RNA sequence: AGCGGCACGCGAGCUGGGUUCAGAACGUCGUGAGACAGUUCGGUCUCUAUCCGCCACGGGCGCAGGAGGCUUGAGGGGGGCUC
RNA sequence: ACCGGAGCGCUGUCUCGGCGAGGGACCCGGUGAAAUUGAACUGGCCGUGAAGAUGCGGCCUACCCGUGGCAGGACGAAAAGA
RNA sequence: UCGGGGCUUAAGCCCAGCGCCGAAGCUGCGGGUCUGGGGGAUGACCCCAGGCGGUAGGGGAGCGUUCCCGAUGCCGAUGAAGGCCGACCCGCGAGGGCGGCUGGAGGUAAGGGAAGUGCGAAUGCCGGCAUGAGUAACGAUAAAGAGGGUGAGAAUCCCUCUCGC
RNA sequence: GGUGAAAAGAACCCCGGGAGGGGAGUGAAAUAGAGCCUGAAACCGUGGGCUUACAAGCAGUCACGGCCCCGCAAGGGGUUGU
């Protein structure tokens, strides 16, 4: 609300394009060594664990 | 004596819907822009029927002129000959009797100059 | 009946001289051939007009004072970006251009109108890529 | 109409510096529950029908029934106590059936009693006597006296 | 067969959760779930919830086996919208739109023969 | 120590000093309310750019085997003073 | 806390601006407005037009879409022109 | 920059003869329209004649609507009304009809009558949803760290330990 | 403002914190499932067909080609390459 106003209603086309560059990006995961399942690259999954395994305390 | 609007405009406006559903734009949905497009299309249809007429005259005369200079000379002289040959019409359209069968045309070209010349 | 529309004919190639010729007058002929106006079954929306390899365009003739007068122009979107070159200098440095410019403007403007420009190869030689047929013309 | 609405007659937003339209009173039609423009108010559709004309009216109408042949003025109705099946057997005997409806013209109330609840036979009688009846229906079943009341209707 | 978990009357505009969904549309259970956990959204919670109710149906209602069970159509549609009234300068009763939505993980076994 | 065009360029960029606001005074005209191409002093231009335009930055693609690095310069932009 | 004019000391008012600082903005994360809104598939010269065009025309640069930023045009929004 | 190009014994200039394009003007065709003549008493209908753009507007005709007489009746669960689909038939036309899918109990012929009748607008009245834009803002520049407990869920509650107004 | 003739107004299993649903069970019917007969329009989604990444747009129109799907034929829808 000022001087530079959206003079006209923008089309559905523009809606979908400005929202074309939107989108998501999928997660990135690898396995957990000395374990079984995933862990994102460079992590110490609580269930699993990096080298030496720290924490791992859940139920 | 009630005159509640009812559903007449429903049926009618949606008649305009199907009458113009297929176009582009919000107008290809918008009841009041759509109709304006209906005007566009119909008016266009009229003007384009007459356009179509002249257009086709052209096309014929195009390929005809090509073949006529090919196996002879310019199209104007071919006409000139055939109006003098009195070969009523030939249908410049069916002067595409050159499009198929070379000898038919070619012969009628020799007839063209045969008349005047 | 119902006017006939050509099938996918095989594009015929052609070769043209150049030297001693008149620029405009030359192209004048080129164009009508880039399209099917020479062929009996010419069709508007198709592109089936002969390809045209032109030789030694480096020696095309031009009347009047063109040589020194005629000035081609190009405009870069930039301020004072107008660039105008005389027909005289167009020959010296890459002259096969002159014939092209001359023709391009003598063809439709639409999509295929540039599509047909592609059908024309011009060489400041003679000499071409002896691709095939290429029956010289007059 | 608009004046008989328990609303105001006062403006809400101004005149020029408004940004919206201009009216104010939520009473005129233009708004939501506005009043009506003229029309639907209580009235009387009636008028005057000249004597002579309407006299002939009955005549013509009634007499036109007579042109067909569907008519009669029984001397006296046999069903003398006003009970349904009396007039019913009476009617089956008097040229009647069931599919034919009766401006049943007559004046003895008792005969009309069966006719008071008569699902085909409207029960038409004399001091009312109209043309719309004889057109809408079927049987001039005249007691001699109903026709008497009619003979004086014209009488000129 | 094909299992379905659907819910209406539930939070978040179609935008963000749609973003979450189509990142995982037509993906197997294990994969898609490994996504659901490692998601920097609340679509993690919502989508994984409905997805899980979807997984369980196939376990003991539709019968398919989850080694084979991957996710088909996930539709996500908008319910009503909360028309909240916020205040603002010079005295406008702002309207603020809280669009509510409709998530639907469908799914099925792997092969057909 | 140029003459000129482009809303005598450029207040969705500044300045609001000059301008024709109500206040007040003054010269002046009018019987007076008030007004005078007469003066005086002070006196609220309003942050989010929608398309275009432009200044850089990318993504997706394309270059009719996939790829890594060295490159051509058609075009085009910058550059030109003087004592 | 009234309007001119002049000198003294002082200073980023100016030459000519450079660095830094916290906070907005920019990336992620949770939510989410507005006035305007016929539709738009919306570039430029030279003319055209009731006098000032992407849209008409003889004609221009350029793949599709986006992000940061500047503010010239859409006779720019605020008004049914003070 | 002639519109553009691209022309120099011309693609310019003026002057003569023949050619051809190119207008819904015209010929042809054939369907509808009104007015004159005629065949048919003939009404219906056909044959000959011409005009066949038009804001205000004058004049005529038609489709559609809510209801009333017809209606103590006619229609209908094999399914009222309306809702949605049609590439189908009838009307020049607004429409009529008919079939497909729905929904669940109303609809009214041929003649006739009457009126809140036909909406695209009025910076239109009410409802409904987007556009802007996942952007601005998330209200003091007095500031927050952890360990644990809690609990489906914790930076955000809670316990303590700390630091700052 | 209207579920149904009437509440028969949905136990028990399942995921889930609940919410809400997936089944079952009910009635003629749950496209009558609890502000629930009807459910359209603008309207926001998901699948599929045709089309789009050298291109100048009141967005259509006339013709022709590509195409996909209805079609006995003949044709018809559709869509857009020029």
mmCIF file of N, CA, C and O in Angstrom, chain B residues 11-56:
data_model
loop_
_atom_site.group_PDB
_atom_site.id
_atom_site.type_symbol
_atom_site.label_atom_id
_atom_site.label_comp_id
_atom_site.label_asym_id
_atom_site.label_seq_id
_atom_site.Cartn_x
_atom_site.Cartn_y
_atom_site.Cartn_z
ATOM 1 N N UNK B 11 -28.695 -21.406 -17.157
ATOM 2 C CA UNK B 11 -28.719 -22.193 -18.384
ATOM 3 C C UNK B 11 -28.126 -21.432 -19.565
ATOM 4 O O UNK B 11 -27.345 -21.981 -20.342
ATOM 5 N N UNK B 12 -28.488 -20.159 -19.673
ATOM 6 C CA UNK B 12 -28.072 -19.306 -20.784
ATOM 7 C C UNK B 12 -26.577 -18.941 -20.773
ATOM 8 O O UNK B 12 -25.875 -19.089 -21.791
ATOM 9 N N UNK B 13 -26.104 -18.447 -19.631
ATOM 10 C CA UNK B 13 -24.686 -18.130 -19.459
ATOM 11 C C UNK B 13 -23.827 -19.380 -19.686
ATOM 12 O O UNK B 13 -22.768 -19.304 -20.312
ATOM 13 N N UNK B 14 -24.287 -20.532 -19.198
ATOM 14 C CA UNK B 14 -23.555 -21.779 -19.437
ATOM 15 C C UNK B 14 -23.673 -22.265 -20.892
ATOM 16 O O UNK B 14 -22.815 -23.012 -21.396
ATOM 17 N N UNK B 15 -24.731 -21.830 -21.571
ATOM 18 C CA UNK B 15 -24.812 -22.021 -23.012
ATOM 19 C C UNK B 15 -23.681 -21.246 -23.676
ATOM 20 O O UNK B 15 -23.043 -21.753 -24.590
ATOM 21 N N UNK B 16 -23.420 -20.028 -23.202
ATOM 22 C CA UNK B 16 -22.263 -19.270 -23.692
ATOM 23 C C UNK B 16 -20.960 -20.000 -23.356
ATOM 24 O O UNK B 16 -20.006 -20.004 -24.146
ATOM 25 N N UNK B 17 -20.935 -20.609 -22.170
ATOM 26 C CA UNK B 17 -19.816 -21.445 -21.740
ATOM 27 C C UNK B 17 -19.459 -22.453 -22.817
ATOM 28 O O UNK B 17 -18.387 -22.362 -23.414
ATOM 29 N N UNK B 18 -20.358 -23.401 -23.087
ATOM 30 C CA UNK B 18 -20.055 -24.407 -24.112
ATOM 31 C C UNK B 18 -19.868 -23.779 -25.492
ATOM 32 O O UNK B 18 -19.091 -24.279 -26.306
ATOM 33 N N UNK B 19 -20.568 -22.673 -25.738
ATOM 34 C CA UNK B 19 -20.446 -21.939 -26.997
ATOM 35 C C UNK B 19 -19.018 -21.439 -27.221
ATOM 36 O O UNK B 19 -18.619 -21.181 -28.357
ATOM 37 N N UNK B 20 -18.247 -21.303 -26.144
ATOM 38 C CA UNK B 20 -16.877 -20.813 -26.287
ATOM 39 C C UNK B 20 -15.827 -21.501 -25.407
ATOM 40 O O UNK B 20 -14.730 -20.973 -25.229
ATOM 41 N N UNK B 21 -16.148 -22.671 -24.862
ATOM 42 C CA UNK B 21 -15.178 -23.413 -24.052
ATOM 43 C C UNK B 21 -14.156 -24.139 -24.928
ATOM 44 O O UNK B 21 -14.500 -25.063 -25.664
ATOM 45 N N UNK B 22 -12.899 -23.716 -24.838
ATOM 46 C CA UNK B 22 -11.838 -24.254 -25.672
ATOM 47 C C UNK B 22 -10.748 -23.221 -25.891
ATOM 48 O O UNK B 22 -9.613 -23.549 -26.243
ATOM 49 N N UNK B 23 -11.099 -21.960 -25.662
ATOM 50 C CA UNK B 23 -10.199 -20.840 -25.914
ATOM 51 C C UNK B 23 -9.093 -20.798 -24.868
ATOM 52 O O UNK B 23 -9.007 -21.679 -24.027
ATOM 53 N N UNK B 24 -8.259 -19.766 -24.924
ATOM 54 C CA UNK B 24 -7.207 -19.550 -23.933
ATOM 55 C C UNK B 24 -7.658 -18.405 -23.016
ATOM 56 O O UNK B 24 -8.727 -17.833 -23.223
ATOM 57 N N UNK B 25 -6.860 -18.083 -22.001
ATOM 58 C CA UNK B 25 -7.138 -16.964 -21.115
ATOM 59 C C UNK B 25 -8.160 -17.300 -20.049
ATOM 60 O O UNK B 25 -8.797 -18.349 -20.103
ATOM 61 N N UNK B 26 -8.315 -16.407 -19.075
ATOM 62 C CA UNK B 26 -9.340 -16.567 -18.051
ATOM 63 C C UNK B 26 -10.693 -16.471 -18.727
ATOM 64 O O UNK B 26 -11.683 -17.035 -18.261
ATOM 65 N N UNK B 27 -10.708 -15.760 -19.849
ATOM 66 C CA UNK B 27 -11.886 -15.652 -20.690
ATOM 67 C C UNK B 27 -12.368 -17.030 -21.116
ATOM 68 O O UNK B 27 -13.548 -17.228 -21.347
ATOM 69 N N UNK B 28 -11.458 -17.993 -21.194
ATOM 70 C CA UNK B 28 -11.844 -19.372 -21.477
ATOM 71 C C UNK B 28 -12.473 -20.020 -20.248
ATOM 72 O O UNK B 28 -12.329 -21.221 -20.018
ATOM 73 N N UNK B 29 -13.174 -19.204 -19.472
ATOM 74 C CA UNK B 29 -13.831 -19.621 -18.248
ATOM 75 C C UNK B 29 -14.749 -18.474 -17.842
ATOM 76 O O UNK B 29 -15.884 -18.681 -17.409
ATOM 77 N N UNK B 30 -14.242 -17.258 -18.016
ATOM 78 C CA UNK B 30 -14.915 -16.045 -17.569
ATOM 79 C C UNK B 30 -16.152 -15.713 -18.391
ATOM 80 O O UNK B 30 -16.037 -15.337 -19.551
ATOM 81 N N UNK B 31 -17.324 -15.816 -17.769
ATOM 82 C CA UNK B 31 -18.604 -15.634 -18.458
ATOM 83 C C UNK B 31 -18.703 -14.375 -19.311
ATOM 84 O O UNK B 31 -19.300 -14.392 -20.390
ATOM 85 N N UNK B 32 -18.129 -13.280 -18.827
ATOM 86 C CA UNK B 32 -18.278 -12.004 -19.518
ATOM 87 C C UNK B 32 -17.135 -11.660 -20.466
ATOM 88 O O UNK B 32 -17.293 -10.814 -21.339
ATOM 89 N N UNK B 33 -15.991 -12.316 -20.307
ATOM 90 C CA UNK B 33 -14.900 -12.139 -21.258
ATOM 91 C C UNK B 33 -15.047 -13.149 -22.392
ATOM 92 O O UNK B 33 -14.746 -12.869 -23.563
ATOM 93 N N UNK B 34 -15.527 -14.330 -22.030
ATOM 94 C CA UNK B 34 -15.815 -15.386 -22.991
ATOM 95 C C UNK B 34 -16.741 -14.960 -24.122
ATOM 96 O O UNK B 34 -16.494 -15.275 -25.287
ATOM 97 N N UNK B 35 -17.831 -14.290 -23.758
ATOM 98 C CA UNK B 35 -18.819 -13.851 -24.735
ATOM 99 C C UNK B 35 -18.176 -12.851 -25.691
ATOM 100 O O UNK B 35 -18.404 -12.892 -26.901
ATOM 101 N N UNK B 36 -17.359 -11.958 -25.145
ATOM 102 C CA UNK B 36 -16.630 -11.002 -25.967
ATOM 103 C C UNK B 36 -15.751 -11.750 -26.973
ATOM 104 O O UNK B 36 -15.624 -11.347 -28.150
ATOM 105 N N UNK B 37 -15.201 -12.879 -26.529
ATOM 106 C CA UNK B 37 -14.492 -13.757 -27.459
ATOM 107 C C UNK B 37 -15.422 -14.416 -28.482
ATOM 108 O O UNK B 37 -14.998 -14.706 -29.603
ATOM 109 N N UNK B 38 -16.672 -14.671 -28.093
ATOM 110 C CA UNK B 38 -17.646 -15.268 -29.010
ATOM 111 C C UNK B 38 -17.876 -14.295 -30.162
ATOM 112 O O UNK B 38 -17.897 -14.689 -31.341
ATOM 113 N N UNK B 39 -18.026 -13.021 -29.805
ATOM 114 C CA UNK B 39 -18.134 -11.945 -30.784
ATOM 115 C C UNK B 39 -16.935 -11.970 -31.717
ATOM 116 O O UNK B 39 -17.090 -11.996 -32.954
ATOM 117 N N UNK B 40 -15.745 -11.981 -31.111
ATOM 118 C CA UNK B 40 -14.499 -12.038 -31.877
ATOM 119 C C UNK B 40 -14.516 -13.156 -32.918
ATOM 120 O O UNK B 40 -14.260 -12.928 -34.107
ATOM 121 N N UNK B 41 -14.863 -14.356 -32.468
ATOM 122 C CA UNK B 41 -14.796 -15.539 -33.311
ATOM 123 C C UNK B 41 -15.802 -15.510 -34.455
ATOM 124 O O UNK B 41 -15.450 -15.809 -35.596
ATOM 125 N N UNK B 42 -17.048 -15.150 -34.153
ATOM 126 C CA UNK B 42 -18.086 -15.139 -35.174
ATOM 127 C C UNK B 42 -17.855 -14.082 -36.241
ATOM 128 O O UNK B 42 -17.906 -14.360 -37.456
ATOM 129 N N UNK B 43 -17.620 -12.857 -35.774
ATOM 130 C CA UNK B 43 -17.291 -11.741 -36.650
ATOM 131 C C UNK B 43 -16.150 -12.151 -37.588
ATOM 132 O O UNK B 43 -16.238 -12.033 -38.839
ATOM 133 N N UNK B 44 -15.091 -12.670 -36.966
ATOM 134 C CA UNK B 44 -13.970 -13.238 -37.705
ATOM 135 C C UNK B 44 -14.415 -14.257 -38.746
ATOM 136 O O UNK B 44 -13.888 -14.276 -39.847
ATOM 137 N N UNK B 45 -15.381 -15.100 -38.393
ATOM 138 C CA UNK B 45 -15.862 -16.143 -39.297
ATOM 139 C C UNK B 45 -16.455 -15.541 -40.573
ATOM 140 O O UNK B 45 -16.161 -16.000 -41.688
ATOM 141 N N UNK B 46 -17.273 -14.506 -40.399
ATOM 142 C CA UNK B 46 -17.834 -13.746 -41.522
ATOM 143 C C UNK B 46 -16.725 -13.217 -42.455
ATOM 144 O O UNK B 46 -16.538 -13.668 -43.642
ATOM 145 N N UNK B 47 -15.975 -12.266 -41.897
ATOM 146 C CA UNK B 47 -14.912 -11.608 -42.651
ATOM 147 C C UNK B 47 -13.988 -12.622 -43.335
ATOM 148 O O UNK B 47 -13.512 -12.398 -44.457
ATOM 149 N N UNK B 48 -13.775 -13.750 -42.658
ATOM 150 C CA UNK B 48 -12.910 -14.826 -43.141
ATOM 151 C C UNK B 48 -13.533 -15.705 -44.207
ATOM 152 O O UNK B 48 -12.821 -16.438 -44.892
ATOM 153 N N UNK B 49 -14.854 -15.689 -44.318
ATOM 154 C CA UNK B 49 -15.473 -16.407 -45.416
ATOM 155 C C UNK B 49 -15.182 -15.629 -46.687
ATOM 156 O O UNK B 49 -14.726 -16.190 -47.708
ATOM 157 N N UNK B 50 -15.403 -14.320 -46.629
ATOM 158 C CA UNK B 50 -15.087 -13.553 -47.851
ATOM 159 C C UNK B 50 -13.576 -13.559 -48.205
ATOM 160 O O UNK B 50 -13.146 -13.787 -49.375
ATOM 161 N N UNK B 51 -12.776 -13.333 -47.168
ATOM 162 C CA UNK B 51 -11.332 -13.509 -47.253
ATOM 163 C C UNK B 51 -10.967 -14.822 -47.935
ATOM 164 O O UNK B 51 -10.164 -14.845 -48.864
ATOM 165 N N UNK B 52 -11.580 -15.904 -47.461
ATOM 166 C CA UNK B 52 -11.401 -17.248 -48.005
ATOM 167 C C UNK B 52 -11.576 -17.243 -49.513
ATOM 168 O O UNK B 52 -10.768 -17.825 -50.258
ATOM 169 N N UNK B 53 -12.648 -16.587 -49.952
ATOM 170 C CA UNK B 53 -12.901 -16.444 -51.387
ATOM 171 C C UNK B 53 -11.686 -15.895 -52.156
ATOM 172 O O UNK B 53 -11.063 -16.602 -52.998
ATOM 173 N N UNK B 54 -11.326 -14.648 -51.852
ATOM 174 C CA UNK B 54 -10.196 -14.047 -52.589
ATOM 175 C C UNK B 54 -8.903 -14.887 -52.497
ATOM 176 O O UNK B 54 -8.200 -15.109 -53.498
ATOM 177 N N UNK B 55 -8.627 -15.344 -51.277
ATOM 178 C CA UNK B 55 -7.511 -16.219 -50.910
ATOM 179 C C UNK B 55 -7.349 -17.365 -51.890
ATOM 180 O O UNK B 55 -6.286 -17.567 -52.499
ATOM 181 N N UNK B 56 -8.421 -18.128 -52.030
ATOM 182 C CA UNK B 56 -8.405 -19.257 -52.938
ATOM 183 C C UNK B 56 -8.158 -18.852 -54.402
ATOM 184 O O UNK B 56 -7.358 -19.520 -55.118
#
